[PDB]
Amino acid sequence: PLESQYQVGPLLGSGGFGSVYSGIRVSDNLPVAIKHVEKDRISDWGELPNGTRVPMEVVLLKKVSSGFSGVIRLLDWFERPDSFVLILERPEPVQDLFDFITERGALQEELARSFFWQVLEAVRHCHNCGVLHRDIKDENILIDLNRGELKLIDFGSGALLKDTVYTDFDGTRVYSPPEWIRYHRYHGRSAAVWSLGILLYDMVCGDIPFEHDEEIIGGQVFFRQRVSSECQHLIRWCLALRPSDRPTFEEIQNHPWMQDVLLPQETAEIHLH
């Protein structure tokens, strides 16, 4: 029984991802997030390793939720007549990265480096598990303010990772790559790297670079804040117009701007506490 195992608290938010409530597991007072998705709104369906037909979001979350990682883990799920209910980790205290950047402005490069590194490790974990998130953005990143750890959320636009072309997309357009805008075609890893360039610009400049299709495909990156030449180079490389010109995840993490990252605990003590 779902309603007997958890106490339901305030609504945390709602939107394209469903409705998410704060919660507490009665078995041990663990903080949880309780996410409701209406069956009628579910676009892509998958099958759990048992034949049970579930939202793709559940398939993807299960693939990435084994062990520790920078991904918010699925703890349990329930099927109801008209909806699915997902029980997810809820760190506390937490702020999503969109609100954090809104409140603090452009981040110091030392802090942006720590956050960006942790996001890269989380995305590498997803890809290692066969999962493409397809909606990397500051709104889908939670900050554990005490531990200095970032967590990826909202796999509702994701897909199984593959090496062939994708011709469907329901992520965030202003983070989508020019080949999607121009041709409605993209490959998974190079499209992810584009969105990471958008995210890094967002962190070091205080807002995303592009709002309109013409800016996405124009591939001119104007820097509105003082940003080091090494960081500018990494951003412009992630935002190369031709997908084959973008760096691999390995080349990003070997980039000179990425060296000497802070540990998560140091990040919390220096920048968040």
């Binding site: 709104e139 509702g156 205080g206 807002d207």
Partner: peptide
């Protein structure tokens, strides 16, 4: 300058 969220759809 206006900073806003962008829905996923």
């Amino acid at each position: 300058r206006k900073r806003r969220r962008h829905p996923s759809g």
